[PDB]
Amino acid sequence: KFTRSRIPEKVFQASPEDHEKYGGDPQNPHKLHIVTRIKSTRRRPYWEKDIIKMLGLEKAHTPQVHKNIPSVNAKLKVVKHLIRIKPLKLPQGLPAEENMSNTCLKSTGELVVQW
Amino acid sequence: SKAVTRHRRVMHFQRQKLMAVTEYIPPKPAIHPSCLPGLIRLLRREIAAVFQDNRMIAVCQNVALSAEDKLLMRHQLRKHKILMKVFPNQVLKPFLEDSKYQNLLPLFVGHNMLLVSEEPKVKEMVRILRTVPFLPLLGGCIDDTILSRQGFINYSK
Amino acid sequence: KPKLRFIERAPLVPKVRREPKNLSDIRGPSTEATEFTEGNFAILALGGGYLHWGHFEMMRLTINRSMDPKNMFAIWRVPAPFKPITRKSVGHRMGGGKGAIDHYVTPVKAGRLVVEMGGRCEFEEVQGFLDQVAHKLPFAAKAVSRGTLEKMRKDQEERERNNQNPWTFERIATANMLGIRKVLSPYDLTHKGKYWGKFYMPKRV
Amino acid sequence: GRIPGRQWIGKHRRPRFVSLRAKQNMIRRLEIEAENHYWLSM
RNA sequence: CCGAGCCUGGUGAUAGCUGGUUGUCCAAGAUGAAUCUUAGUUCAACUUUAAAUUUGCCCACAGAACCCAAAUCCCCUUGUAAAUUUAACUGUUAGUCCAAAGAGGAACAGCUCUUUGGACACUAGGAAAAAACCUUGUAGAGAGAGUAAAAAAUUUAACACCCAUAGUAGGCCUAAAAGCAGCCACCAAUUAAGAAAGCGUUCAAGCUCAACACAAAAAUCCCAAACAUAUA
RNA sequence: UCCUUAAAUAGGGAUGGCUCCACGAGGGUUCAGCUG
RNA sequence: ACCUCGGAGCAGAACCCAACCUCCGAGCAGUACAUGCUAAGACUUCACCAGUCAAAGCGAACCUUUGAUCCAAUAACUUGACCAACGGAACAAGUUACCCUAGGGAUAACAGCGCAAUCCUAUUCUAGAGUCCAUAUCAACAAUAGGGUUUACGACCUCGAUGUUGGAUCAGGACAUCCCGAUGGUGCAGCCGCUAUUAAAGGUUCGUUUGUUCAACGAUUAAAGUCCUACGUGAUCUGAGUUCAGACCGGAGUAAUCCAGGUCGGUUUCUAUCUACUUUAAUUCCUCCCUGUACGAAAGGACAAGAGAAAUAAGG
Ligand SMILES: [Mg+2]
Ligand SMILES: [Mg+2]
Ligand SMILES: [Mg+2]
Ligand SMILES: [Mg+2]
Ligand SMILES: [Mg+2]
Ligand SMILES: [Mg+2]
Ligand SMILES: [Mg+2]
Ligand SMILES: [Mg+2]
Ligand SMILES: [Mg+2]
Ligand SMILES: [Mg+2]
Ligand SMILES: [Mg+2]
Ligand SMILES: [Mg+2]
Ligand SMILES: [Mg+2]
Ligand SMILES: [Mg+2]
Ligand SMILES: [Mg+2]
Ligand SMILES: [Mg+2]
Ligand SMILES: [Mg+2]
Ligand SMILES: [Mg+2]
Ligand SMILES: [Mg+2]
Ligand SMILES: [Mg+2]
Ligand SMILES: [Mg+2]
Ligand SMILES: [Mg+2]
Ligand SMILES: [Zn+2]
């Protein structure tokens, strides 16, 4: 039968080679994911459809910010084949109330407070 | 259709693509490496002993003879104390340098039949060879003294 | 008794209860009789299949005729036909229950040794008729010595270790990368993409 | 040269072949998802 | 126009059966039980509307059997915004193909059953045409832009070269079977050679192992045209 | 099995059991003739 | 044969899961006579009906499957008949081709389409036969391909005027070649065969029985090929078998009726709208010459080349 797939934990254990390749430090890990839906939920199980709806990724290619916490990561693991995940980078820290209206998410994944 | 079939079942195109993508890729071994840069010892010792046992040596090309003719020639040679030998050039070429015979290198090539002896009946051997107008005598070296065919003729006479 | 023992068509006491056609007994790698036992040569099954009594007779006759009884000895590494294939009548409309037993047959999985030779004789002396018998067999088969078996195995690990493809069927299936488990069988996680139905792809890492 | 029955469903189907383009597309998706694995590992 | 006339009436007979069922626009909306029952219906499930108030789904850890696998169930968080209940209610409710686990059949069927999931009965792009495969969905106008899936690949059989003295036809039984119908030993010389590995002899005789030595075929008519090398 | 034909899945013959006189747009077989 | 209920597998791990699916079992008994009464809270065979479990309490003591309602009977408590088609018409069978209506391609037969078990063909292996001799020839057990000609299977198109088989007419096509052509081998001296490669331009008979396709038989032929074409072709024909209403024989049945059987008889419509189409270098055989020459011990008997006769086909 076709069922939900249990991903073995070893899949989500980065190696030093991966760290060099992708440029993320396991210590001080990134706080927020930028997740975009790059694949249709059609012809996918209803549970993947539901996970996408929960994460708010109904529109493709529309970035959404999520917490990099284990539960959100569990959902993202369920639907990892439909999404692109990149860390949210904050070169100038999180925006202040003054410049909350002058931010822009660069394609590199950086939220710049100047635009 | 069942999961197991007598014929090879058609794969879902996604599975086919998966197989193609995960096909084995052999490594390239750098620049093409090809394009890149006790009978033997029995013969060794036997020939080592023979080189001292013999006092006069000669060589011929007794390959043009028949089995019966070769047997008769061997009988006529065994009438005397001379003994007929053959040994690979493959192992004799090392033997020449081993026994310090530099002038003997360009004498042994192809079929070579040694005629090791200590008493010259070469007069009668040449007489026997005469009635068979072939199988010419080849150069040899008696007691470390190289003799040409003219040398053998003079020594015989 | 340095000769290959005769195999009966059907068990003396048959199975009163008809059993289903569990093709899993042909699907996948063989876990039993995968290694040599008191022999040097054998016929390796490079695919799964069902060995009928006709195949048993072919093997027995050919090997017994073409081996030296005094030096070469043979041994079956496969049980006698024990699975009834309840082939129905020679024409009838579908239904009416399940059919009756007509032939008996023994399942064989890939990697299973079928017949094992032994005695004072080298591999090339036996390659000929073992290869003929292997071709006769209903599944892919190969005349394999102990040395050749170990050589091909070591070659398989060499492939698995040296392939430059970043993408392996194991990695993709286990991680469910492209949602391919929507297309794969649960058995594919363990067959690692080397088995498809009863066919085994040795060339495929 | 006809395929018996209806194409793409029966026991005997049109042979489908994987183009280099299809292979590249699948590999691209696989790379994206390998990156997803890495970013989900922390 | 007689297996039971014709006309009128009952009569607008009855029909679980066939056909038909007329303005515009928007929205929600899809696969069990019983039944003289499987061409139908009732209940359920689903569905629609309105209403009430309060948790609903996802969900890790912990937890769920002895006998003899994929997964599932359960729920703190978390992502989310839905769920339950109340009132009213029609209609759909004995489907198709694809992937997967099985059963039956013939490990046939565009075959028949059960289960998980997907798609179709809904838009569009692609796979030649194309319900069911792949990409993709929420709707309009545009003479803008980035993309998704998306193009089949392969061509394949030469071969070393030599020459082979003799114990003896090794014996046994075998008319003789000597290497060859068969057992048993399987030594041996020259420098170097298996009392037989294959042809051929009633038996001999004549030849080679070596070693000396150096894939495909079916019926109207093949089926885009073509192209090997201009930068990824 | 015999006759019929060169050839014969045709035709004819070796209360019950038989006897077909005549008849028939009945159903079969046939000689001869006749003929598009 | 089955129809209700239950246990096991399919259905491996909450529940749930079919079948003409694979197996098994039951229509109660034994026990006691608290095996009483009441009652929180729950389960539930996917609905309902029905069916389960149960603390506390009271009362004695110190249990382990079949069925509704109505209706009857009993003073009542309670009880019964079947309802086993086991959600149960209170009580009703055969038959229809004399049939009728409403429908159904959601459902049979011919046909089409899948499939290839069966069937057919080709290779691989030599077991083996072939006096020896695998491979001149044939061939077992099997293996691998291909075909879609049989027998079957499926129920996907067509049941809102298409019977079917044979025959006639006209044929289109495949080649897996029956003849004619060209070759290799041969267990081919010649003739002859056997085998294989290539070849689809052309050709491929007439009769008796039978409705016959086939078949047997007779006589021929260079040969009387295997197939596909809706088992080609009935808006071109025929209706002999089979198929409708009549009737017998035999058989089944109480009868009505029926029958894969035997027999006699039995309506075959269409004025063509559209497409399409309506004038596209022969073949064989025999005789003769070569020549009763080659070949062959003889018997027998050629090639290749040429001439003459016919015959057919086409065109006049
Ligand atoms: Mg088609
Ligand atoms: Mg009237
Ligand atoms: Mg009405
Ligand atoms: Mg809508
Ligand atoms: Mg009833
Ligand atoms: Mg009905
Ligand atoms: Mg007649
Ligand atoms: Mg009258
Ligand atoms: Mg319930
Ligand atoms: Mg009933
Ligand atoms: Mg009932
Ligand atoms: Mg159906
Ligand atoms: Mg019509
Ligand atoms: Mg041909
Ligand atoms: Mg047909
Ligand atoms: Mg008639
Ligand atoms: Mg009648
Ligand atoms: Mg009849
Ligand atoms: Mg009649
Ligand atoms: Mg009449
Ligand atoms: Mg007509
Ligand atoms: Mg007309
Ligand atoms: Zn080079």
Side-chain angles (χ1 to χ4, degrees):
Chain A
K1 304 187 201 305
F2 183 50
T3 60
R4 284 81 172 275
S5 53
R6 286 179 29 85
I7 317 301
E9 262 303 314
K10 64 99 174 179
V11 174
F12 305 103
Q13 289 164 5
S15 74
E17 294 78 3
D18 300 333
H19 293 300
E20 303 306 314
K21 180 176 181 179
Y22 298 113
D25 49 353
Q27 284 74 38
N28 187 30
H30 72 275
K31 293 211 289 194
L32 298 173
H33 300 290
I34 307 167
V35 294
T36 71
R37 177 165 82 67
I38 59 167
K39 195 72 168 60
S40 195
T41 61
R42 307 228 63 202
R43 306 164 191 282
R44 299 308 308 175
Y46 68 89
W47 58 83
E48 295 178 14
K49 295 198 183 77
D50 296 351
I51 294 288
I52 284 288
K53 277 179 48 55
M54 293 160 187
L55 296 169
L57 297 174
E58 311 94 351
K59 274 188 75 75
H61 316 296
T62 300
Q64 184 65 255
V65 62
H66 276 286
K67 298 158 153 171
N68 184 22
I69 59 177
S71 49
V72 176
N73 286 358
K75 287 190 182 64
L76 265 55
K77 288 170 190 180
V78 172
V79 292
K80 56 188 185 53
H81 57 282
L82 310 169
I83 63 184
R84 179 198 311 271
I85 306 166
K86 307 287 279 295
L88 173 73
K89 286 172 294 186
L90 290 162
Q92 295 87 18
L94 57 91
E97 183 65 28
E98 173 173 341
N99 51 62
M100 201 75 71
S101 199
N102 305 320
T103 64
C104 195
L105 182 61
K106 289 286 150 290
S107 61
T108 58
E110 298 173 345
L111 188 65
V112 292
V113 300
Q114 293 181 353
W115 188 232
Chain B
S1 60
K2 298 259 192 301
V4 172
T5 62
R6 287 184 175 91
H7 65 97
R8 186 169 273 94
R9 189 173 71 254
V10 180
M11 307 184 182
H12 195 274
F13 188 47
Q14 294 299 110
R15 200 209 171 94
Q16 203 174 344
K17 283 194 293 172
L18 175 66
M19 295 284 263
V21 170
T22 59
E23 264 167 2
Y24 165 83
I25 297 179
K28 169 56 59 182
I31 313 179
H32 183 74
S34 162
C35 288
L36 275 174
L39 275 299
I40 187 66
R41 75 217 70 186
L42 189 146
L43 294 169
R44 297 262 158 194
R45 61 185 159 239
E46 189 172 6
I47 301 306
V50 158
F51 268 125
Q52 288 103 28
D53 188 4
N54 60 353
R55 181 221 67 191
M56 69 97 83
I57 203 170
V59 60
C60 284
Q61 312 186 17
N62 304 275
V63 71
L65 293 167
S66 297
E68 65 276 15
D69 288 329
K70 191 181 289 294
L71 185 71
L72 269 73
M73 179 269 290
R74 170 79 172 175
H75 293 187
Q76 275 79 73
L77 267 68
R78 294 183 77 183
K79 285 176 69 176
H80 197 65
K81 204 253 181 183
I82 180 162
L83 269 299
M84 188 273 288
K85 317 281 189 177
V86 185
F87 287 97
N89 291 114
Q90 184 179 2
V91 71
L92 190 143
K93 298 288 103 176
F95 286 153
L96 305 174
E97 56 83 20
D98 195 3
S99 303
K100 192 255 292 177
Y101 294 153
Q102 286 68 240
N103 288 321
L104 270 67
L105 268 293
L107 294 177
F108 307 100
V109 56
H111 300 90
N112 54 0
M113 266 53 70
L114 297 175
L115 297 173
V116 294
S117 178
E118 298 67 43
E119 294 82 2
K121 201 168 102 194
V122 287
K123 294 175 282 294
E124 192 172 0
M125 280 183 278
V126 171
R127 286 289 297 160
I128 293 165
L129 264 290
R130 277 175 183 176
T131 190
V132 298
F134 70 101
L135 191 61
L137 265 289
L138 202 69
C141 178
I142 176 167
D143 62 26
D144 294 333
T145 56
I146 190 166
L147 281 181
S148 179
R149 49 199 47 73
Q150 61 269 11
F152 291 105
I153 295 296
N154 194 6
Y155 185 73
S156 297
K157 194 177 184 294
Chain C
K1 285 188 174 181
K3 187 175 285 295
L4 194 55
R5 202 260 302 162
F6 171 74
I7 299 298
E8 188 46 61
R9 317 186 49 112
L12 305 178
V13 63
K15 293 182 171 60
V16 298
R17 182 163 174 178
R18 283 82 60 86
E19 67 183 2
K21 51 164 74 67
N22 48 306
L23 304 165
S24 294
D25 55 16
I26 297 306
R27 186 181 186 181
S30 188
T31 57
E32 47 171 331
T34 303
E35 311 296 327
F36 275 86
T37 59
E38 310 183 24
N40 51 11
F41 320 126
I43 292 180
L44 182 65
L46 297 181
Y50 285 123
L51 280 179
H52 296 242
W53 182 80
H55 298 116
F56 270 97
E57 289 315 298
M58 174 267 305
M59 282 191 276
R60 192 183 57 91
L61 296 177
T62 52
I63 290 165
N64 284 349
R65 179 199 320 117
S66 59
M67 75 164 160
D68 177 28
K70 68 175 185 180
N71 285 338
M72 305 177 179
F73 76 92
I75 189 68
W76 286 110
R77 299 292 312 284
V78 62
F82 71 89
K83 176 181 176 65
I85 47 168
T86 60
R87 189 258 175 284
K88 272 191 167 171
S89 306
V90 290
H92 274 81
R93 294 159 87 175
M94 303 202 314
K98 186 166 172 58
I101 313 171
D102 192 18
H103 284 249
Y104 265 90
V105 65
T106 182
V108 175
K109 285 184 180 181
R112 175 75 170 271
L113 298 180
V114 181
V115 294
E116 185 176 3
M117 297 292 286
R120 187 179 295 113
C121 61
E122 61 86 11
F123 184 48
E124 278 88 8
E125 285 172 353
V126 174
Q127 176 89 353
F129 63 97
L130 284 194
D131 190 76
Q132 273 78 69
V133 167
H135 174 274
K136 291 272 194 169
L137 285 175
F139 39 82
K142 190 176 177 181
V144 187
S145 169
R146 297 175 74 103
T148 59
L149 183 53
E150 287 293 329
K151 181 175 74 175
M152 64 177 71
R153 285 178 182 168
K154 288 187 183 296
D155 293 331
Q156 184 65 29
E157 291 86 5
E158 285 286 330
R159 301 272 294 281
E160 296 179 281
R161 284 188 292 100
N162 68 3
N163 67 346
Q164 270 58 48
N165 200 359
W167 309 111
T168 66
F169 196 101
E170 198 76 347
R171 180 154 187 251
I172 306 184
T174 61
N176 193 14
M177 296 266 294
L178 305 174
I180 60 166
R181 292 191 65 175
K182 191 162 176 289
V183 178
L184 299 182
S185 176
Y187 289 135
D188 289 330
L189 270 68
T190 61
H191 300 323
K192 310 187 182 292
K194 291 179 271 283
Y195 298 85
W196 170 245
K198 68 176 187 69
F199 305 94
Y200 160 62
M201 282 76 76
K203 62 92 178 177
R204 201 180 179 285
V205 61
Chain D
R2 63 182 293 278
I3 282 293
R6 188 264 182 276
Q7 291 169 170
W8 305 125
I9 69 162
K11 158 152 68 165
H12 302 314
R13 307 175 184 183
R14 285 187 70 237
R16 180 69 175 171
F17 307 108
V18 294
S19 54
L20 178 74
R21 184 169 49 179
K23 281 156 48 60
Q24 287 165 354
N25 294 348
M26 176 155 294
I27 286 166
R28 195 176 313 118
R29 224 160 298 275
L30 286 164
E31 291 168 352
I32 294 170
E33 186 175 3
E35 186 156 358
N36 282 357
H37 288 177
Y38 170 75
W39 291 121
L40 280 176
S41 73
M42 46 192 283

